[PDB]
Amino acid sequence: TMNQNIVTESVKVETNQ
Amino acid sequence: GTQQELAQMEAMELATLFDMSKPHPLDNAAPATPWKGELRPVPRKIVLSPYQYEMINYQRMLMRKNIWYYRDRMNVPRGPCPLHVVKEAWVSGIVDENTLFWGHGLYDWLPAKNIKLLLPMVRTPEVRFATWIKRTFSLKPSLNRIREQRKEHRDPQEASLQVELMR
Amino acid sequence: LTDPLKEDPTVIRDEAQFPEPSLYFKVFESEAGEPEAKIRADVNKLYDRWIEKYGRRWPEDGINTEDMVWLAEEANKRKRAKPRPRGTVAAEKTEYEDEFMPDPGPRTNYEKTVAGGKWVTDEFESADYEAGNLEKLWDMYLWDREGKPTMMPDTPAAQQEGEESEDFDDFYTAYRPRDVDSEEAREAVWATDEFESDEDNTESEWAPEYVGAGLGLVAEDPLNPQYSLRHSNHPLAPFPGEPLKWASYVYPDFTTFEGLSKQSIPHGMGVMTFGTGTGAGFAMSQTRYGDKYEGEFQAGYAHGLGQFTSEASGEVYIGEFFAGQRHGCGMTLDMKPYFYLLERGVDPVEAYRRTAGAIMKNVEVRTWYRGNKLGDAKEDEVVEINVLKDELDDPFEIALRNSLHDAKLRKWKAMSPQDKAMDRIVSIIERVQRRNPGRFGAYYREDEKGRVRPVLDSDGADTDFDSVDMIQGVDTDGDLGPGWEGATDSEENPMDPRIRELMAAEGMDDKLEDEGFKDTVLGSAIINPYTGLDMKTYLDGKERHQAELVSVYKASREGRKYLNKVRKDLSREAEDDRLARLYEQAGVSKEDERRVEGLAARWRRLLARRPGNPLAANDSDTGFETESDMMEMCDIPEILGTVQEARQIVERARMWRFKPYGEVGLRMAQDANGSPVSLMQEPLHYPHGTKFMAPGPLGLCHAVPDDPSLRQEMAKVAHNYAAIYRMYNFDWDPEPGTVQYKIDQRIRRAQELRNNAMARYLAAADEVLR
């Protein structure tokens, strides 16, 4: 399938996964 | 009978007392007296033992050749700073007790007041008098003028760093 | 009750003399290999003795004649094994008189000395006493009537052939009847000096400990676990001796390092940028010009947590490192398209919008072992497969194994330490014999004529041991392993049989030549005169060969006739009967055993590499040599936590990157044309309206340049500064509902519980004592 970088967003999406 | 059960329960509580993930009923409990904002009383009489004198002398021996560094608001190390350069920066109001400093004897960057012997070295009587003059007659009126001139400094949320510069 | 955390600090008063008697007059077990401490120890004893007599740690008069006697014999004693005296002489004094020294508070030397014993008489030389001590220790005659040695050569040492002269007190101690140990030998020859009569062996000298990351350790002081790192070279070891220095090194290959360093080696945290070549333990082919590693360093290696970034290729790795290679959990990103678009004149926002999704989809999470990625050789399913394999056995074996597992624990629980040592020795011997069992009973034979001859095998070998694996090693199964220029990436391409056989024959003749040289060099000496044991066989480890040869020769007909001519002028049955007794005593007939064996084999086994978990921590018999080539793979939460902590480590390590006046800063900070730039790092000057960066009251006087990204950066820096600040400054009276409040509550509860426990213990003690 306040400010964050790409690594944080990817980690959060995997955490949701 | 009941004593043994109570002892076993107390041992079980001791087993998991410092497990910070486990909630405890004594957390956020009501204190014996109503809470009021207190401050630690200032000591008056201090009597140092020879142990403390010799420990202080040893620490002064270790740090008598140190060169210090400090960090600014943008998180950038700032300049090779011998003792007199540190004193001049302290007098000029560029650094204070909350600035992050580093020396030879440390592993990380710490606030200036949390280093063992850094404030006694800087704060000679002349340094105190000069920093008091600088705070009272130069920085404070300029802060008042800049607060009055520009509305971007919100009146309800104003810093008080200039007030405590003398210390 | 009184609040322990709210004592009034009105008057502070400490009373501690700097030469603290608690810390000064003390001998530590940490000081074991230091010779001078020994002397101090004796001095300390003297102090106590004086305190036991005068109570002042100072003697009336001074050191007396009996103090040395007390400190020599009575003060400290050493462990011996066993005496066995006798009450009748076995020698004659009819020879030259005064040959043997006589032997009949008189209790001991100390008792007589304190009773008025001068001890001033002097007589005789030391060599006679040492020779007598050695002679009584051997229980032999080492010198004859004339005075020439009987057990060691008496001729002058041949300067040729490499031999040198040796005194008797060394030869009779380095060559002994094996019932005398090193300590008794040293005690017999009067070795007393601490500084010159003692040396440290190569394999027994003191060395600093190795703790790695130092996470799992037994804390001697539970409150401060850093106290346990004092005997290592860990970056956080207390008081190394030389302060850690902010090193900023530029190497001739333009590899740069900036960060903490011990001595002159990178140590602690830092950032390393690679130029031509490599560094920090990385392989030569991994790095390029411009790549960087940020994070923990140890002994010059990238060891710990970190991040590796490559601007040329785009690979970004965040996670664990061991030695100089990836080992542990890690996360890998490929930001190559973002850099590609950035380098082609595209603003960062547009490039991110174009290439965010593809980069986010290709994020990889992995577990690495020694630089290799796991998950392709079914490393994940090893444990379950082994469990199923263990479950696939026959029921009788499983039941017996499970019963034995409990039986071993129940037996070990009650054994004596000596019994435990003997059991472990037996287990070690069995484990060794599982690989190289000796050919006992098959070393020597007698031929038809009756002459003794060696027993070889289908090859030119006398024992399974080969001396060529000492320089090449052996794998777990038994294969040798890599050698010099072995080539043959995979040995499915074998060597030609003709060459193999020719080289085998050449190796055999080389072995024959080696045996000939060893014999002609070492076979002349005699180690054990009773069995004719020469030095060659003794140093080759073939003593059992001689032991079997002696019995084979003596049992032979030729040996018996030779013995007659010179005279003219456990067992298998025991084990079998013991097993029969064990069977009978348990009420189990052999018919029952046969029935059970038939049921297991014909009915169950016929119906349808040691058992255990390959990755096991506790393994009873291990040998500490079997190597696991894999590890339990990290799961997603563990990888996420590892990345979360690695980012913190990288952020903390990136604070040593731009030392104000350092070689890297002076030589690598350049503008577009490559000329050096004047970085704004002056401790006193803030030019071009940048005085808002001053971390003091001066900064508040000036205004920020009104840039949202700059404001966010400043807010993040302020948040980090506040996070650092909160760890060293606390509140005297915390408000309820805060973390510190619950911490104080738990501390007070702990104190109260300990007080209640101590009160109960005191009540029990009072009940017992009265």
Chain C 677-696, CB below 8 Å of chain B: which residues?
680-684, 686, 692-696
**Partners of residue C149 on adjacent β-strands:** C143
H helix or E strand, kind and range, residue C333 = strand C325-334
Count CB atoms within 10 A of the CB of residue C750.
Answer: 14
Do the Cβ atoms of B80 and C683 come within 8 Å?
Answer: yes
Contact yes or no, A with B (3+ CB pairs under 8 Å): no
Q: How far is CA C17 from CA B61, C13, C28, C348, C752, in A?
A: 20, 13, 21, 66, 33
Beta carbons within 10 angstroms of residue C235's beta carbon: 21
Rounded Cα distance, C378 and C696, in Å: 59
Half-sphere exposure of C277 (CA within 13 A, CB side): 12
Which among C15, C693, C746 is the nearest to B49, CB-wise?
C15
Residue with tokens 């106590």: C48
CB-CB contact of C741 with B28 (8 Å): yes
Tokens linked to C361? 């989809």
Distance CA B152, CA B149 (A): 9
C-beta neighbour count of C559 within 10 angstroms: 17
Quote the radius of gyration of chain B (alpha carbons, Å).
Answer: 24
Q: Give the residue among C234, C228, C230 at the shortest CA–CA distance from C212.
A: C234
For residue C139, give the DSSP letter.
Answer: T
For tokens 């050191």, the residue is C63
B-C CB pairs within 8 A amount to 207
Question: Hey, are the CB atoms on C757 and B43 less than 8 Å from each other?
Answer: no
In angstroms, the Cα distances linking C146 to C71, C95, C143, C154, C668 are 40, 13, 8, 12, 85
Query: Which single residue is written with the structure tokens 């140092």?
Result: B48
Which residue of C356, C643, C647 is in closest CB contact with A6? C356
Beta carbons of A11 and C643 less than 8 Å apart: yes
Q: Testing the interface with C: which of A10, A13, A16 to mutate, by most C Cβ within 10 A?
A: A10
Q: Are strands B45-47 and C11-13 parallel, antiparallel or unpaired?
A: parallel
Cα gap B96→C291, rounded to integer Å: 38
Nearest Cβ partner for C697 among B39, B77, B165: B165
Q: Report which residue type is found at C436.
A: N
Q: Tokens for B163, please give them.
A: 């007030």
Q: Do B28 and C760 touch (CB under 8 A)?
A: no
* Exposed e or buried b per residue across C459-486, where buried means at least 16 C-beta atoms within 10 angstroms of its C-beta: eeeeeeeeeeeeeeeeeeeeeeeeeeee
The answer, for A3 touching chain C at a CB cutoff of 8 Å, is: yes
| Residue in C201, C191, C238 with CA at minimum distance from that of residue C30 | C238
Q: What is the resolution in angstroms?
A: 2.8
Does the beta-carbon distance from B93 to C696 stay under 8 Å? yes
Q: CB distance from C719 to chain A under 8 Å?
A: no
> How many other C-beta atoms are found inside a 10 Å radius of the C-beta of residue C530?
6
- Chains touching A by CB (3 or more pairs below 8 Å): C
Residues that constitute the known binding site of C for Mg(2+): 622, 626
Closest by CA position to B70, among listed C580, C383, C22, C693: C693
Report the structure determination method.
cryo-EM
* Cα C467 versus chain centre, distance: 27
Q: Which of A6, A8, A13, A15 to mutate to test the interface with C (most CBs of C within 10 A)?
A: A6
How far is C237 from C299, CA to CA, in rounded Å?
A: 14
Task: Name the residue with tokens 């220095």.
Answer: C245
Q: Verify whether the Cβ–Cβ distance C661 to B44 is below 8 Å.
A: no
Distance separating alpha carbons of residues C380 and C66, to the nearest angstrom: 73
From CA C55, how far away is CA C72, in angstroms rounded?
Answer: 23
Which region, left, alpha or beta, applies to residue C538 given φ > 0 means left and ψ of -120 to 50 means alpha? alpha
- List residues forming the annotated binding site of C: 622, 626
For B86, the closest chain C residue by CA position comes to C683
3-state secondary structure of C113: helix
Burial of C12: CB neighbours in 10 Å, binned 0-12, 13-18, 19+: exposed
Q: Is the dihedral of CA C582, C587, C589, C595 positive or negative?
A: negative
Instruction: State the alpha helices, DSSP H only, in C527-661.
Output: 535-540, 543-555, 557-568, 572-585, 590-598, 636-653
Q: Within 10 Å of residue C604's Cβ, how many Cβ atoms?
A: 13
SS (H, E, C) C252-298: CCCCEEEEEEECCEEEEEEEEECCCCCCCCCCCCCCCCCCEEEEEEE
Nearest to C3 by CA among C584, C748, C642, C683: C748
Q: Is C154 left (phi over 0), alpha (psi -120 to 50) or beta?
A: alpha
Other Cβ atoms within 10 Å of C68 Cβ, number: 12
Which residue is associated with the tokens 């038809």? C448
Encoding tokens for residue C140? 């032999």
Q: How far is CA C548 from CA C38, C540, C544, in A?
A: 49, 16, 6
- Measured between CB atoms, which of C12, C684, C742 is closest to B94? C684
Contact C17 B93 (CB under 8 A): no
Name which of C335, C352, C363, C651 to mutate to probe chain A: the one with the most chain A Cβ atoms within 10 A of its Cβ: C363
Residues from chain C contacting residue A12 (CB–CB below 8 Å)? none
